[PDB]
């Protein structure tokens, strides 16, 4: 019947999250552009809270991703058409 | 867009209301030492702020007087990066051979407060002024003459165990950037923890 605190999880925040360098396995590290790691507890200041029994999924939207897939394919096709036109022009010159 | 925004205000008044256990064991006034928990009965921790907004931990020690019934000894300590430096009361009537000066609290037989510091207000010596304190607080360039006023007019001693019923202070450290939005005028507005 001894309920004793064994520690608390460390929470690390960087000022520029866009600048974190991407390691493997959904991990990041701090770099020159990301600033120094700000060490703090949870629920303090600007830090968030820690909830047990939950996981975070991806933050992607399948609708938006599929639409961006369509748009990127269309841009690719248009640029390939431009390249084809240029090759046709060069071949047209080369047949005088 | 600063990550912390605010105007820090130094700690000047500390109002504390506690209930002190009447059934707790008596302790020796002269043998008090904050490094030894068994010399006193209870210890509470609080956070205080300087002029520049630095956070410091204030630990309060309560000791049950053995020579005089219904009497308690209270000592303050300020924790800096070098250790725990005791804080001394200029006109406190509780003294130790180690040079740590506290204040005495007396209570009536019905459990109500009888007297505080022989009727004198509890004002502590300057935190970071070495001329007044043998253990100056390292305030890192902040105001060294900062002093604390402690109010315990509602402290009581009943049969109930130790309890920190109320803790009130005027300190204010800083904000923490929490959200950012832009209005139609292009003004960038940020809200903070405070």
């Amino acid at each position: 019947g001894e309920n004793v605190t064994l520690g608390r999880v460390a929470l690390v925040r960087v000022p520029n999250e866009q600048g974190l360098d991407k390691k493997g396995g959904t991990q990041w590290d701090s770099t020159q552009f990301s600033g120094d790691k700000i060490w703090g507890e949870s629920n303090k200041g600007s830090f968030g809270t820690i909830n047990n029994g939950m996981l975070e999924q991806s933050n992607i939207d399948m609708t938006q991703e599929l639409v961006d897939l369509i748009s990127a394919q269309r841009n690719f096709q248009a640029n390939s058409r431009s390249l084809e036109v240029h090759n046709q022009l060069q071949q047209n010159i080369l047949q005088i | 867009i600063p990550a912390e925004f605010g105007k820090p205000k130094q700690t000047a008044n500390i109002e504390v209301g506690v209930n002190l256990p009447a059934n707790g064991d008596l302790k020796d006034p002269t043998q008090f030492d904050f490094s030894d928990p068994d010399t006193y009965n209870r210890s509470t921790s609080s956070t205080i702020y300087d002029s520049m907004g630095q956070s410091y931990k204030l630990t309060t020690y309560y000791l049950k007087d053995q020579t005089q019934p219904n009497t308690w000894n209270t000592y303050y300590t300020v924790t800096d990066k070098e250790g725990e430096k005791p804080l001394n009361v200029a006109a406190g009537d509780a003294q130790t051979p180690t040079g740590h000066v506290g204040h005495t609290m007396k209570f009536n037989n019905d459990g109500t407060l009888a007297s505080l510091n022989n009727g004198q207000p509890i004002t502590s010596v300057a935190l970071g002024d070495p001329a007044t304190n043998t253990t100056p607080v390292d305030m890192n360039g902040a105001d060294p003459a900062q002093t604390l006023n402690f109010g315990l007019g509602s402290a009581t001693q009943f049969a109930a165990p130790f309890e920190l019923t109320k803790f009130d202070e005027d300190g204010a450290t800083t904000g923490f950037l929490t959200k950012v939005d832009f209005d139609e005028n292009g003004s960038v507005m940020g809200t903070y923890s405070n």
């Binding site: 999880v9 929470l11 959904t26 990041w28 701090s30 | -």
Partner: protein
């Protein structure tokens, strides 16, 4: 042709970014990436400037949009989630707390030494607090036991 080739390359970079986003639809803690592009234009004292076209499309940066993702519920105390701003700190080696990396997924467990580790057996970092202490006593990071 070089400008058309640049357009093809930019489109293919956007395709790769989107496909990488799609593939990681199920992974825990993933953050979507957005690819941004910038124009290419550079003229000499010796070109007429108004008689010269542009120079194509250049890739600016692959962003790492860090907006909060959705949560699933496993009713397992070893699973942790950061609601709001923050990262977990995980150490490759137990002894060293300097070599640490930031992560968002919280699939943790106990290993044979009773240390809270991730899937890769990388030890999570935490603060030392005494059984009677209050706030963090030693604010240095060491593995949670």
């Amino acid at each position: 042709s070089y400008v058309s080739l640049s357009g093809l390359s930019a489109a293919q970079l956007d395709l790769n970014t989107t496909s990488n986003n799609i593939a990681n639809a199920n992974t825990y803690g993933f953050k979507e990436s957005r690819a941004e592009f910038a124009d290419v234009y550079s003229n000499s004292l010796f070109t007429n400037a108004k008689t010269t076209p542009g120079g194509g499309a250049q890739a600016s940066q692959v962003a790492q949009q860090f907006h909060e993702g959705s949560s699933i519920y496993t009713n397992n105390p070893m699973d942790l989630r950061v609601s709001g701003t923050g990262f977990f700190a995980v150490a490759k080696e137990r002894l060293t707390p300097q070599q640490n990396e930031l992560t968002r997924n919280g699939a943790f467990h106990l290993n044979k030494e009773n240390y809270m580790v991730t899937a890769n057996d990388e030890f999570l970092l935490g603060y030392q607090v005494d059984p009677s202490s209050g706030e963090v006593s030693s604010y240095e990071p060491q593995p949670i036991n």
